[PDB]
């Protein structure tokens, strides 16, 4: 439970810091003195400090540890420290009665995906499953945000498809 979980988090924080020390070419004691001690005093747990950095940016540590550490800590924390997320998936059935309907569909999807993906922390992806099915996968901080992204994307796709004389439909997987 709790304590063991504290052990495992501290173990991992130690391996990560050691990796950083090596990359940055610094002795282990220095890493402890300069990084471990400061972060532990203020976040109460070094791994939690690494999680904040992973979620809210490496600058959360700026000021608490020398600057030379930030670069290497970012790369390492970003690779190994998970950030809470949810992913949902749905699919569109899109028909565009035109010799070039297919390419028009990609254009619309590509445009919708890119737009949606410029939003911080959101990651949208489309998977063509063979006409007229297009699966959509969304990753976001929480379910509310992910649903809002879907709704936004669906509104744009339907609008654009009905403009090109086609027809789009959003299907949702009923889970229970």
């Amino acid at each position: 439970k709790a304590k063991l979980q504290e052990f495992k988090r501290a173990q991992k924080a130690e391996n990560l810091l050691k990796l950083a020390a090596e990359k940055l070419g610094k002795d282990f004691e220095t890493a402890w003195r300069e990084v471990w001690v400061p972060l532990e005093e203020e976040w109460g747990e070094v791994y939690a400090a690494f999680e904040d950095a992973a979620k809210d940016g490496i600058d959360v540590l700026k000021g608490h540890v020398p600057d030379e550490w930030l670069p290497v800590l970012k790369e390492i924390i970003d690779n190994y420290v998970e950030v809470p997320t949810v992913t949902i998936d749905a699919e569109f059935e899109i028909t565009v009665p035109k010799p070039n309907g297919v390419e028009i569909i990609k254009e619309a999807l590509i445009r919708a995906r890119d737009r949606a993906n410029k939003e911080k922390d959101v990651e949208v992806k489309f998977t063509y499953l063979g006409a007229p099915r297009y699966r959509i996968d969304i990753t976001a901080p929480d379910y509310y945000k992910a649903e809002e992204v879907l709704e936004s994307i669906a509104e744009e796709i339907l609008r654009v498809i009905k403009e090109a004389g086609g027809e789009a439909t959003l299907l949702r997987k009923e889970k229970r």
Side-chain angles (χ1 to χ4, degrees), residues 2-176:
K3 265 292 172 180
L4 165 69
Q5 214 63 333
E6 177 180 50
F7 169 65
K8 294 155 74 173
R9 287 163 64 80
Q11 269 308 112
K12 188 174 180 182
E14 189 188 311
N15 283 320
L16 299 175
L17 184 59
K18 286 188 182 184
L19 201 63
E22 278 149 25
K23 205 153 307 185
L24 190 68
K26 288 200 173 298
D27 81 333
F28 289 7
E29 302 165 12
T30 299
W32 173 69
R33 191 186 91 231
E34 288 171 36
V35 183
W36 194 279
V37 175
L39 297 191
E40 184 164 279
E41 300 267 7
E42 254 151 17
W43 277 259
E45 176 187 41
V46 176
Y47 201 74
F50 286 177
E51 289 170 318
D52 182 336
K55 188 207 147 190
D56 300 297
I58 189 83
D59 271 344
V60 302
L61 304 178
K62 190 145 194 166
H64 308 66
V65 306
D67 295 292
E68 80 220 273
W69 286 91
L70 301 175
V72 57
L73 280 172
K74 177 192 189 64
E75 202 187 308
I76 292 176
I77 295 178
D78 288 337
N79 291 325
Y80 306 94
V81 182
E82 186 183 308
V83 184
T85 66
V86 300
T87 186
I88 55 172
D89 56 275
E91 70 172 285
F92 294 88
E93 298 207 318
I94 310 167
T95 52
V96 173
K98 308 217 3 172
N100 64 352
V102 176
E103 175 57 49
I104 287 184
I105 295 185
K106 294 188 182 178
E107 288 189 59
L109 299 193
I110 287 296
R111 222 108 67 178
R113 175 237 286 161
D114 290 339
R115 194 179 304 304
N117 277 342
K118 68 181 180 180
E119 173 166 46
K120 305 179 173 183
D121 280 327
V122 172
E123 309 187 309
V124 174
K125 159 197 181 183
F126 284 96
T127 302
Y128 179 50
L129 309 183
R133 298 196 305 160
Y134 297 73
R135 161 173 176 143
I136 184 175
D137 282 277
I138 302 180
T139 298
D142 52 75
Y143 289 113
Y144 169 71
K145 182 63 157 186
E147 285 305 321
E148 213 56 291
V149 173
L150 218 204
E151 183 58 62
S152 168
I153 295 178
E155 256 166 42
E156 182 180 317
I157 288 174
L158 270 63
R159 175 176 61 242
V160 179
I161 291 300
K162 261 149 207 120
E163 294 191 318
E167 195 187 317
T169 298
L170 171 66
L171 297 170
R172 283 289 251 150
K173 278 188 155 36
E174 302 302 284
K175 290 292 170 180
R176 269 199 184 198

